[PDB]
Short mmCIF file of C-alpha atoms and ligand atoms in Angstrom, two decimals:
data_model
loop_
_atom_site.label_atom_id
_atom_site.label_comp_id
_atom_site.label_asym_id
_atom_site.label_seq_id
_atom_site.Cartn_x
_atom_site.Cartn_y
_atom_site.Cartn_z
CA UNK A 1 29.34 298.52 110.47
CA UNK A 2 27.70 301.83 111.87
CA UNK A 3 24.23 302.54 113.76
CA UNK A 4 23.60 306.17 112.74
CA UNK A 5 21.23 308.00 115.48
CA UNK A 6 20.67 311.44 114.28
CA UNK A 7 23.79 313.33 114.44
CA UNK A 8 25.58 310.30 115.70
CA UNK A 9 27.40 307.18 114.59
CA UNK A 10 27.72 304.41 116.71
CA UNK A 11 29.99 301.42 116.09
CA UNK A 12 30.92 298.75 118.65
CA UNK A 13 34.70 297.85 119.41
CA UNK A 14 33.92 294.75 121.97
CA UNK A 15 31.09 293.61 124.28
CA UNK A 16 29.91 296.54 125.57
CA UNK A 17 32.56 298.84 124.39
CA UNK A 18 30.88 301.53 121.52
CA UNK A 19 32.99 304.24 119.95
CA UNK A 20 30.54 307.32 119.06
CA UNK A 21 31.59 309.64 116.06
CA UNK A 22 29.98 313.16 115.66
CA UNK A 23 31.12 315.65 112.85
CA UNK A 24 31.51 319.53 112.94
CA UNK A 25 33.01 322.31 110.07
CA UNK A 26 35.03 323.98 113.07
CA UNK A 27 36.70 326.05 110.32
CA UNK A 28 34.61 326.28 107.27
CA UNK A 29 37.02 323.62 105.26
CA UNK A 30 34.46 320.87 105.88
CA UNK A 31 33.27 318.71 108.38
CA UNK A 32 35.89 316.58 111.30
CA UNK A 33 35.00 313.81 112.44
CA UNK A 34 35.54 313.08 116.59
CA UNK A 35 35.78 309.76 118.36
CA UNK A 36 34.54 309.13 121.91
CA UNK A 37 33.89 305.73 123.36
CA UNK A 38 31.04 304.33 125.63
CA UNK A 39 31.81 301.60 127.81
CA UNK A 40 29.36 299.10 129.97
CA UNK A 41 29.62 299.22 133.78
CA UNK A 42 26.91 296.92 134.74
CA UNK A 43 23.63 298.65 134.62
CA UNK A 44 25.25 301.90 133.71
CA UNK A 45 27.86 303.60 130.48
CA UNK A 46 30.79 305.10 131.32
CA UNK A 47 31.43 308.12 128.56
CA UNK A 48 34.91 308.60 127.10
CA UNK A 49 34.70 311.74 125.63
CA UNK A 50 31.94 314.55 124.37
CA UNK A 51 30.43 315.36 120.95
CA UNK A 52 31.58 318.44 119.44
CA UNK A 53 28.02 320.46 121.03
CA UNK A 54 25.80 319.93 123.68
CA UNK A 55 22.99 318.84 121.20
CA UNK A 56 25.45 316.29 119.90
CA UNK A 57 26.11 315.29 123.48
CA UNK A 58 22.56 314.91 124.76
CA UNK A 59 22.21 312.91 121.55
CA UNK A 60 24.79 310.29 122.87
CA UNK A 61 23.05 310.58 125.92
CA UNK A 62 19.78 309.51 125.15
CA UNK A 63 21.18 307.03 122.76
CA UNK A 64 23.02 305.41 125.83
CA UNK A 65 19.98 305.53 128.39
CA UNK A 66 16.87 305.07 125.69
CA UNK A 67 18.52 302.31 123.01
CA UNK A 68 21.39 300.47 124.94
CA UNK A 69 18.95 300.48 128.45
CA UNK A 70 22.80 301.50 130.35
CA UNK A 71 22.45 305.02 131.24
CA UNK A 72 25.21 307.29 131.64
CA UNK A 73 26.84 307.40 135.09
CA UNK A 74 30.72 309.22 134.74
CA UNK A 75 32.25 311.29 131.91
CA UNK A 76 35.97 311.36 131.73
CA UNK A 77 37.39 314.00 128.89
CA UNK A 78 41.10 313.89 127.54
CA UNK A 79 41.68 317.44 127.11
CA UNK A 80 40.64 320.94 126.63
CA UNK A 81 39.33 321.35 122.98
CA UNK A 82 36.05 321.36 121.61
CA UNK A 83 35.98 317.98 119.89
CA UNK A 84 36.60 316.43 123.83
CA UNK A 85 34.95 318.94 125.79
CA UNK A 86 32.22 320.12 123.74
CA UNK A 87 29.18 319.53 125.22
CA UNK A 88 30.29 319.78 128.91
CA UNK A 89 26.95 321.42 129.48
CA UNK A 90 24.89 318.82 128.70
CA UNK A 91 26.22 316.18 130.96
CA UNK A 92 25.70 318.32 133.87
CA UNK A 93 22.37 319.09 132.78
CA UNK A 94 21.84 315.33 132.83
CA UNK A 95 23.37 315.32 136.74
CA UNK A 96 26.24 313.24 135.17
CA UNK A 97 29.47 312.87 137.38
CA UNK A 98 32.58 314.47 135.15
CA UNK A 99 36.01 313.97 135.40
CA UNK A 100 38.78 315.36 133.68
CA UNK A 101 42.44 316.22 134.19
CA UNK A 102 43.20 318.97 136.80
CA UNK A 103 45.18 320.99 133.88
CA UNK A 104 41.91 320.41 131.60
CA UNK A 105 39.93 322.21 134.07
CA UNK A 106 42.33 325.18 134.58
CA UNK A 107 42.82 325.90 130.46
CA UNK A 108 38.61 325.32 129.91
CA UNK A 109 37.06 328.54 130.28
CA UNK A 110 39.85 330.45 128.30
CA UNK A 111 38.72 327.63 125.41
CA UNK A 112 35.52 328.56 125.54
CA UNK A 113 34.56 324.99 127.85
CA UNK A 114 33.01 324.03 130.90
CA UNK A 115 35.69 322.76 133.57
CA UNK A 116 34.50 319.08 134.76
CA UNK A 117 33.46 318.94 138.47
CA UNK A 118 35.79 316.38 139.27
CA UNK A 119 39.56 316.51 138.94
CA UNK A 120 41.22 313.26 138.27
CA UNK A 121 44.11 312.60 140.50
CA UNK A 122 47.13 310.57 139.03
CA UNK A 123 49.68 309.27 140.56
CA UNK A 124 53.60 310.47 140.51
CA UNK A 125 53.44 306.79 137.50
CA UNK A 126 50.98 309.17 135.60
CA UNK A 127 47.86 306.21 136.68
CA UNK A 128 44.67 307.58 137.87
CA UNK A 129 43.91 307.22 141.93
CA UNK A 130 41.53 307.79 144.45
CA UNK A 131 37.75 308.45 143.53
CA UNK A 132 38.20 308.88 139.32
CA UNK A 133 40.29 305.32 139.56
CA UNK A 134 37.28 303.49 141.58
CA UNK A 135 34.54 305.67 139.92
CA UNK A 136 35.53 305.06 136.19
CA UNK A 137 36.85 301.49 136.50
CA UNK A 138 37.29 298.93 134.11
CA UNK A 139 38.81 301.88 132.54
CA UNK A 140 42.37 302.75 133.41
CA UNK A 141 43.11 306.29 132.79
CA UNK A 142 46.99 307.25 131.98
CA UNK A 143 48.68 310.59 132.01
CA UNK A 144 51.50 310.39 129.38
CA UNK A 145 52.53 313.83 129.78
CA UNK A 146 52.41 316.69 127.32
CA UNK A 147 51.95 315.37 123.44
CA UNK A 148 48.82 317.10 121.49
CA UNK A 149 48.12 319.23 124.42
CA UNK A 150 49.87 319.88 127.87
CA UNK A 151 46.93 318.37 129.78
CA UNK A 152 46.22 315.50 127.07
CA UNK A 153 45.24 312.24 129.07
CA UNK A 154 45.10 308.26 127.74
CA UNK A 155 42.44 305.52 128.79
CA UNK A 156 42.22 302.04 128.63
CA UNK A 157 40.42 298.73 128.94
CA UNK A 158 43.40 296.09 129.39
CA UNK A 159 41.55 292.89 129.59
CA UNK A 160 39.62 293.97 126.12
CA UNK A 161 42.82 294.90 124.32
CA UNK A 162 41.46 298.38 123.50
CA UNK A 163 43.51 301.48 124.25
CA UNK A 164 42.59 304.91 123.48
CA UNK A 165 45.12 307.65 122.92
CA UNK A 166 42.62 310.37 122.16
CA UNK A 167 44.11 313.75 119.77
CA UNK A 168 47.47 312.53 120.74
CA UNK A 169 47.62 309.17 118.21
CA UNK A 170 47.27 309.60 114.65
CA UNK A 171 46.21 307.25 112.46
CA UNK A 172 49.39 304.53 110.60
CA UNK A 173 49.21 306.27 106.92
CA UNK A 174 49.10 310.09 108.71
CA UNK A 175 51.36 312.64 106.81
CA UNK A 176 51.46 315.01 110.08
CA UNK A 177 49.91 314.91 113.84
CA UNK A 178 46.89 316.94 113.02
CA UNK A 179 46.43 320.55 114.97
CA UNK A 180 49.35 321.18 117.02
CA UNK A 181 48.58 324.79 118.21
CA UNK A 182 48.71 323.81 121.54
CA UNK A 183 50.88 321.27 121.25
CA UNK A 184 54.10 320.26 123.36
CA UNK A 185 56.57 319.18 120.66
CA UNK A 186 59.71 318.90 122.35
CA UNK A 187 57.75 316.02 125.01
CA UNK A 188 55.53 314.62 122.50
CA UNK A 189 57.50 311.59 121.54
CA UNK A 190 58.29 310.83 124.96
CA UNK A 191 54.33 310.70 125.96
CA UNK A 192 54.07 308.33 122.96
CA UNK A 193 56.86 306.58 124.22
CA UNK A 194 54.49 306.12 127.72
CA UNK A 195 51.17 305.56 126.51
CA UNK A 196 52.76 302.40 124.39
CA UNK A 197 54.25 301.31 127.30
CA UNK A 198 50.78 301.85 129.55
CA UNK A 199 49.28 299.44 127.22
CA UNK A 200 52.08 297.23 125.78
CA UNK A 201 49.44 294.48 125.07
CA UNK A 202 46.64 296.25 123.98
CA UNK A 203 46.33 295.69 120.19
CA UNK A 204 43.01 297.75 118.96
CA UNK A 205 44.68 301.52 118.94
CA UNK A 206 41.75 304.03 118.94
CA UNK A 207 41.69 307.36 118.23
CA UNK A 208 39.96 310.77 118.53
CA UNK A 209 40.11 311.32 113.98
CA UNK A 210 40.44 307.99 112.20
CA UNK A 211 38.53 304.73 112.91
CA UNK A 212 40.50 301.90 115.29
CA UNK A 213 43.62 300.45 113.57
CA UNK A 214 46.25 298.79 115.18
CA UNK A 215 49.60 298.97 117.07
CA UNK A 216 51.02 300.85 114.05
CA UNK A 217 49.03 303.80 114.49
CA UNK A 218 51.43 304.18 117.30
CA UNK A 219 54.82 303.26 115.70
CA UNK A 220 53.67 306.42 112.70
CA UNK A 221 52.73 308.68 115.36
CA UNK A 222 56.08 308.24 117.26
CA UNK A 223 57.79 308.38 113.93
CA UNK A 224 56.30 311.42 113.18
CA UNK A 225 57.08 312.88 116.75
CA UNK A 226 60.39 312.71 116.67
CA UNK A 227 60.81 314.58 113.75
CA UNK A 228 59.24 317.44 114.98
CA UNK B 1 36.71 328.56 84.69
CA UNK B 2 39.96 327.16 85.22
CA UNK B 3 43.79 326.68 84.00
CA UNK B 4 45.10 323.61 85.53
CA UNK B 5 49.18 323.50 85.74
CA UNK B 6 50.30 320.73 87.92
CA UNK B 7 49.26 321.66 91.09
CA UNK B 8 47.95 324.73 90.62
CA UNK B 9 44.64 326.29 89.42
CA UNK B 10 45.04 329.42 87.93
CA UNK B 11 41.20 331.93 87.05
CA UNK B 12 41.71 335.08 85.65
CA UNK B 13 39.47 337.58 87.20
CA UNK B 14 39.92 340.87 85.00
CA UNK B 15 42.53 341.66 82.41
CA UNK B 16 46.09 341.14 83.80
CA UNK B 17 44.92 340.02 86.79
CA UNK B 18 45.02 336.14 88.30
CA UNK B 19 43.90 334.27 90.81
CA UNK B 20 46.15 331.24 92.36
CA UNK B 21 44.92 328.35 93.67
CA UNK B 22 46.76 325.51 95.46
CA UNK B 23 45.50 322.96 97.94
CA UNK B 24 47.44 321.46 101.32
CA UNK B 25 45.84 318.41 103.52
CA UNK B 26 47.46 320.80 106.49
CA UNK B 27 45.93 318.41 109.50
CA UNK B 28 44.68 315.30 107.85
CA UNK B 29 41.58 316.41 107.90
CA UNK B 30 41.23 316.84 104.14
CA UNK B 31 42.65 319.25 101.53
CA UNK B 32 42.52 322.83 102.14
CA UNK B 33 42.36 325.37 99.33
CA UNK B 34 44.78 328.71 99.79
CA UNK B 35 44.32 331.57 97.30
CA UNK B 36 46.37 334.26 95.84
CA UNK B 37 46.72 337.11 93.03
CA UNK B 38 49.42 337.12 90.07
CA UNK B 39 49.20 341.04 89.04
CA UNK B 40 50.67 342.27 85.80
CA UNK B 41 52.36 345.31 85.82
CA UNK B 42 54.09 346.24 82.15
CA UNK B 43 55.98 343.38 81.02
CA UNK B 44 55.96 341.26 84.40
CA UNK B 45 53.80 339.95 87.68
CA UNK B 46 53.36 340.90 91.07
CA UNK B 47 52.59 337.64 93.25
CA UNK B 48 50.15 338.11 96.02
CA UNK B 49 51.25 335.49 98.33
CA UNK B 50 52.73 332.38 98.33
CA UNK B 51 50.99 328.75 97.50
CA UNK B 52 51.43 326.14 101.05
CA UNK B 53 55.15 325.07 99.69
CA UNK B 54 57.85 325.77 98.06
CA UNK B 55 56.99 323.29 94.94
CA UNK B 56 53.78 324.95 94.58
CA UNK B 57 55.25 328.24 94.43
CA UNK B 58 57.53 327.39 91.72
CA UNK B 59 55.19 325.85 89.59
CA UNK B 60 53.40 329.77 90.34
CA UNK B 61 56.59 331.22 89.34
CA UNK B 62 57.47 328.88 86.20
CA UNK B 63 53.55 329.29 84.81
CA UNK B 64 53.92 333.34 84.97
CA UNK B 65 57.31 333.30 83.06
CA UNK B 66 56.60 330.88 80.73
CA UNK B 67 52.91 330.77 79.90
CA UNK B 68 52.17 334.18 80.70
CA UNK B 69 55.40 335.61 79.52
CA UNK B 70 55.33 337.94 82.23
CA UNK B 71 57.49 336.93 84.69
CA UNK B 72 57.21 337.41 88.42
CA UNK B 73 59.38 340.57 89.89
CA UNK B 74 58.01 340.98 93.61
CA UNK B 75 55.80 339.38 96.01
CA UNK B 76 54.01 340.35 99.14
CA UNK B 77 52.25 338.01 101.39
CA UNK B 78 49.45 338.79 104.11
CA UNK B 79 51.15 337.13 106.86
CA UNK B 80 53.18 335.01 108.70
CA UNK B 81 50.61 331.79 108.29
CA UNK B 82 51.91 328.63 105.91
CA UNK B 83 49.47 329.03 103.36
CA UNK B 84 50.57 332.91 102.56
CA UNK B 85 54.19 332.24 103.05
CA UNK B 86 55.05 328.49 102.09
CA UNK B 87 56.73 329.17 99.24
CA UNK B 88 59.22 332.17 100.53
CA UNK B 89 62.14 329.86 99.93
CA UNK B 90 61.25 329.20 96.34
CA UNK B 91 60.69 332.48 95.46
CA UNK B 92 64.66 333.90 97.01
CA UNK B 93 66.00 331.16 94.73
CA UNK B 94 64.34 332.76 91.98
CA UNK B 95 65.73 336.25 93.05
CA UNK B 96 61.94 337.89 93.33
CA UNK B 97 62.01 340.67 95.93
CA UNK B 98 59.93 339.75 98.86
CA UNK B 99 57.83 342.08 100.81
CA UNK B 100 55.71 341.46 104.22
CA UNK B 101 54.31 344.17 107.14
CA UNK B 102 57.36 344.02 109.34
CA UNK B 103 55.38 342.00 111.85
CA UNK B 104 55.19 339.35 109.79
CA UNK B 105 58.69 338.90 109.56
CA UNK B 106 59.59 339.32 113.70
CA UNK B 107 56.73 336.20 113.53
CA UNK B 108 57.55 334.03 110.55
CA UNK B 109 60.59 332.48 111.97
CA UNK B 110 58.90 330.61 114.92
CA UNK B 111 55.87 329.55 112.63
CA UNK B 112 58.47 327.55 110.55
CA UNK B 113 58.73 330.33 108.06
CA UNK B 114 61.35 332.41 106.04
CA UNK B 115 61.28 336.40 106.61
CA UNK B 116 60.79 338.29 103.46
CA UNK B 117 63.45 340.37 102.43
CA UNK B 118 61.94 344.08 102.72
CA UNK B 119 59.23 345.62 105.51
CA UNK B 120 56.70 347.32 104.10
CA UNK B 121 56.66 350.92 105.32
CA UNK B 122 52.44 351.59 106.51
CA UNK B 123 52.20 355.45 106.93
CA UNK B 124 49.45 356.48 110.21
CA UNK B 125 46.55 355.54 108.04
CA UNK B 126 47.58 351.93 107.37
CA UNK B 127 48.67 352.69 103.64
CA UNK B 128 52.12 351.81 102.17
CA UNK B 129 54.14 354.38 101.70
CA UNK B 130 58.12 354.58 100.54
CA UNK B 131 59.87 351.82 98.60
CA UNK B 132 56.60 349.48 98.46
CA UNK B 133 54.24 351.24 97.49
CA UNK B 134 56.50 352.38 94.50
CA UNK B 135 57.57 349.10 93.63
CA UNK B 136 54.31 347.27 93.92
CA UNK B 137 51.95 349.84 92.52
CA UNK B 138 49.63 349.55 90.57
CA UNK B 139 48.82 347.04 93.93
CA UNK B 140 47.42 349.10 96.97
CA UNK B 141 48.42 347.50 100.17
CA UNK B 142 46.35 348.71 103.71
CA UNK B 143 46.97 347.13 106.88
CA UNK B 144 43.51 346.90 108.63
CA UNK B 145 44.99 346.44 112.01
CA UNK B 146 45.10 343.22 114.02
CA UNK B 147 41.88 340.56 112.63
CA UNK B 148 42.88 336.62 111.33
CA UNK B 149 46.29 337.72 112.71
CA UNK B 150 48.12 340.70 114.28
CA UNK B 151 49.89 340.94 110.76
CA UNK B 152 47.42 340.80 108.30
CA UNK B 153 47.45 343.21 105.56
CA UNK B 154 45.06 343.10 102.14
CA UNK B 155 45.76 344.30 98.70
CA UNK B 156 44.15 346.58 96.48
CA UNK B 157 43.04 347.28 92.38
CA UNK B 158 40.39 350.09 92.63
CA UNK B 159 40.84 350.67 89.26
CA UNK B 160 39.61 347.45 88.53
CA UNK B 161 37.19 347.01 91.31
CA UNK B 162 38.82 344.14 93.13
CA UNK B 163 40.05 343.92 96.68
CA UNK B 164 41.71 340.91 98.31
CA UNK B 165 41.02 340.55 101.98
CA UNK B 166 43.35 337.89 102.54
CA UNK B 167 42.55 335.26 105.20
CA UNK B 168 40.64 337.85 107.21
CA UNK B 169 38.14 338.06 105.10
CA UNK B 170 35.59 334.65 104.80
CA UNK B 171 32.74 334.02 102.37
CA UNK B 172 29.48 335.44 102.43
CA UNK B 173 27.37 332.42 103.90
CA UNK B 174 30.47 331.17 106.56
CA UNK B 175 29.62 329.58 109.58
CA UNK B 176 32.88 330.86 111.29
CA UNK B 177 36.09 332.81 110.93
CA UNK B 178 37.83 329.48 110.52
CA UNK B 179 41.62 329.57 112.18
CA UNK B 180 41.81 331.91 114.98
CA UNK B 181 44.40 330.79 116.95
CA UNK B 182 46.73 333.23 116.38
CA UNK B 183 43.31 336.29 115.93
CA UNK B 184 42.96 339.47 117.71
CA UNK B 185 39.21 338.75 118.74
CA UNK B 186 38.92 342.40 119.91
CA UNK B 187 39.94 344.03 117.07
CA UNK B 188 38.92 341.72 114.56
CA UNK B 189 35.12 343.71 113.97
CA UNK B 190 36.66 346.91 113.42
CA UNK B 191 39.72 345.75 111.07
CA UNK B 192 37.24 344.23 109.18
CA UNK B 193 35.23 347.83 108.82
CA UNK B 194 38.80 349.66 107.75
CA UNK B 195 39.69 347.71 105.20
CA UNK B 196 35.74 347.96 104.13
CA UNK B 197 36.51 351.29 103.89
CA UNK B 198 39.72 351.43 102.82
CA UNK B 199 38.38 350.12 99.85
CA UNK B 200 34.79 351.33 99.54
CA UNK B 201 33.72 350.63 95.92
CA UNK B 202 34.85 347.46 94.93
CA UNK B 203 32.72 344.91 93.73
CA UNK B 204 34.34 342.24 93.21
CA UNK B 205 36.23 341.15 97.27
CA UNK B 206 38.66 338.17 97.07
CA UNK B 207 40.38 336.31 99.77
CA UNK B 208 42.18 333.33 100.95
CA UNK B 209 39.81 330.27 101.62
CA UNK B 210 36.70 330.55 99.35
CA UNK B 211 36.47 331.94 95.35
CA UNK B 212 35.37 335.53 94.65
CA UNK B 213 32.39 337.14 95.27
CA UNK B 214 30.36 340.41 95.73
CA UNK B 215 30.66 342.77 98.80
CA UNK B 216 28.48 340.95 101.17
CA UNK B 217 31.68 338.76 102.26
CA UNK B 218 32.88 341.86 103.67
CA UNK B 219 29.22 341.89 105.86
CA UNK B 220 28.76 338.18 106.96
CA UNK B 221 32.85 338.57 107.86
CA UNK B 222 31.72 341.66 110.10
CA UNK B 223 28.71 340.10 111.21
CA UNK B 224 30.69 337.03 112.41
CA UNK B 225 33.52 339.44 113.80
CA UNK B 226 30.87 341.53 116.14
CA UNK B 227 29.83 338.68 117.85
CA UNK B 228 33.51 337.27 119.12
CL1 CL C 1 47.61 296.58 127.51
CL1 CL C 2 37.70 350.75 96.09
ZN1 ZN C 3 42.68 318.57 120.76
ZN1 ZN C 4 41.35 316.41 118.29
ZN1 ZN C 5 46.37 332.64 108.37
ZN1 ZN C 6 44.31 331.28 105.83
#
């Protein structure tokens, strides 16, 4: 089941858990899908995630503030590629509080991105701390290490059973992990190794390319990690 | 129209000359067309690069030698990217003489790739000279300089009016230069206007990721390539 609000699709995961899916042709062999999440803090959305473009952002936006009456308050971002990172531009022309990975922000501008203003600090476990733990909360952010990308992060909502592994999980039938230009492959198991044990309960697996699934999305991703 | 033989999809595009077709799913994000040449030269072929594996570039081979009765004696690819050099395996166990830019081969090896067997001498101008040019004439290969990749050469017929721009070239109404992540962004503008003039009267201007068309792929390419 899928709301469809001009360039977006909405579906909802849980109570006041949506996953947002916006499409771009980033290399002329037809259009990729992206998944972000918006989750309910109260009277406000926390955003997991950008569109692919600003317009696509501001599109999620007004979606969030005009339709579900919980305007955005935080943006966290796993990593530094369009798909996540996107429509950086719009948030901040919103005045929305972003958060992203301190590696994120350092590999941005060379990707053609907008650093966030905020970098998340994580703990020597790889759990989010400080202001990005008590800003973004019920979400629990994760660093698994280097998978997808270097600065690829993980975030979760325990007591729903939902855990997101972003670009890094692939779906249970995938044939190969997707675009690994910038990929780590010698640590990539071992960060899927960490993000299953971040979540060890959680059994709706999201993702940022295929629609949720569960726990086996992680078992063919590790699978096809340690072949690499 | 179209020759379907297994995997492949063979159109001819002037007398003795073919174009190959095969298709890869390279990131999950849906099939992805590659296309090369099949050249006839007396009693044989000349493959212009390879299809994404080594089963599709035997069923390339096995169609030339035993529908076309011309069976393939050398190959040159257009660089050291999966869907121009799959297939290099497939084609040493046939015993076809394999020919790349010698940058291509210093590169294949860490993109999960076999070497071809020869370099191809380029004289100052960016022509073949020597062995290569000898052996795969009636073909005219010109390395542009650095575009798509640092290693990307293109392939010639004036006679016939065709020119194959490989993977640096895209179609006339793209949106994008599709895969850069391995482009020379500077260059990639002016590459584009050598091999323009390299080969200034063809008509009909094939390439890697999109069917054949007229000469205004060559300005849309450049048009995209200006604004990097
Ligand atoms: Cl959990
Ligand atoms: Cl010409
Ligand atoms: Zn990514
Ligand atoms: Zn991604
Ligand atoms: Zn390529
Ligand atoms: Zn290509």
């Amino acid at each position: 089941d899928i709301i469809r609000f001009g360039e977006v699709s909405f579906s909802q995961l849980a109570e006041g858990v949506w996953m947002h899916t916006t499409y771009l042709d980033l290399m002329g062999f037809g259009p990729i899908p992206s998944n972000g999440l918006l989750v309910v803090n109260g009277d406000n959305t926390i955003l997991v995630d950008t569109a692919w473009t600003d317009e696509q952002t501001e599109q999620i936006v007004a979606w969030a503030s005009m339709v579900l009456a919980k305007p955005v308050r935080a943006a966290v971002v796993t990593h530094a590629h369009q798909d996540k990172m996107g429509g950086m531009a719009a948030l901040h022309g919103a005045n929305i509080a972003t958060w992203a990975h301190p590696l994120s922000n350092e590999l941005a501008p060379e990707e053609g991105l907008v650093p966030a203003r905020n970098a998340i600090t994580f703990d020597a476990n790889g759990w989010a701390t400080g202001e990005a733990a008590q800003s973004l909360a019920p979400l629990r952010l994760y660093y698994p290490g280097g998978a997808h990308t270097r600065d690829n992060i993980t975030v979760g909502l325990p007591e729903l059973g939902i855990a997101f592994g972003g670009c890094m999980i692939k779906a249970g039938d995938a044939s190969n992990l997707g675009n690994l230009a910038d990929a780590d492959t010698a640590a990539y198991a071992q960060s899927v190794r960490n993000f299953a044990a971040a979540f060890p309960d959680a059994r709706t697996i999201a993702m940022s390319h295929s629609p949720p699934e569960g726990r086996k999305a992680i078992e063919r991703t590790l699978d096809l990690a340690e072949e690499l």
